């Protein structure tokens, strides 16, 4: 996020970091319950990657996180690799996340929900702060 | 550069499809929603993370970070997968697995 600010630690408890087997962060995701993460289809997640829950400071080796294996990846079969439409993938965790002060689920909308233009929303992550 | 160690956040407004298409035109498709152009930008490493809005007091997943300006410009709309257009697929996938 460019021109954002540091989050209060643990205050976005659905935010996960998707990492390869070496710990390299390549995408974010959101917990929707103890067993499932929703992320983007273009992240290309495989069952070799891992969901890291409860994280704040990726440079702190001492923070208590949950490294969660992925049992199955459900890429929306309508993801369009040319137009980037339908960019959504679900990850089924092989072991449930343990919910806590710093790990819990975001709510999901109904298909008919209207979120009006101009509504102030929030996005979060560990992406670049300068391109 | 390198990514920040510590989780970042930004507040930002949802854009109407019309106003988003004033910049991106026909690249904006029916399962996309735009937000930003407000002095903040998602950028590399943010993909797949949340865009949340409050619904009756509870944070609700409205977008998934997807794509945008190739240099993460803070004056152009960021584009997000539109969860309302995709949530029936979500619920079906959960129910079957």
């Amino acid at each position: 996020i460019v021109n954002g600010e540091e989050a209060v630690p643990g205050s976005w408890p659905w935010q996960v970091s998707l990492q390869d087997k070496t710990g390299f962060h390549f995408c974010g995701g959101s917990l929707i319950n103890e067993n499932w993460v929703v992320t983007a289809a273009h992240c290309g997640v495989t069952t070799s990657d891992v969901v890291v829950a409860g994280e704040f400071d990726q440079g702190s080796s001492s923070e208590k996180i949950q490294k969660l294996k992925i049992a199955k990846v459900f890429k929306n079969s309508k993801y369009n690799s040319l137009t980037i439409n339908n960019d959504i993938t679900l990850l089924k965790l092989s072991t449930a996340a343990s919910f806590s002060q710093t790990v819990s689920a975001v709510c999901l909308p109904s298909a008919s929900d209207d979120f009006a233009a101009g509504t102030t929303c929030v996005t979060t992550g560990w992406g670049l702060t300068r391109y | 550069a390198n990514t920040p160690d510590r989780l970042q956040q930004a507040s930002l407004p949802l854009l109407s499809n019309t106003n988003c298409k004033k910049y991106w035109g026909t690249k904006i498709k029916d399962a996309m929603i735009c937000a930003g152009a407000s002095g903040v930008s998602s950028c590399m490493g943010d993909s797949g993370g949340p865009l949340v809005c409050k619904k009756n007091g509870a944070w609700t997943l409205v977008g998934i970070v997807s794509w945008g300006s190739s240099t993460c410009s803070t004056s152009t709309p960021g584009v997000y997968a539109r969860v309302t257009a995709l949530v029936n697929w979500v619920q079906q996938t959960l129910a079957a697995n």
Binding site: W12, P13, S104, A105, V106, V122 | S11, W59
Partner: peptide
């Protein structure tokens, strides 16, 4: 869902 135990602080 959607209610953090630790409240965010937004500027």
């Amino acid at each position: 869902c959607g209610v953090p135990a630790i409240q965010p602080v937004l500027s």
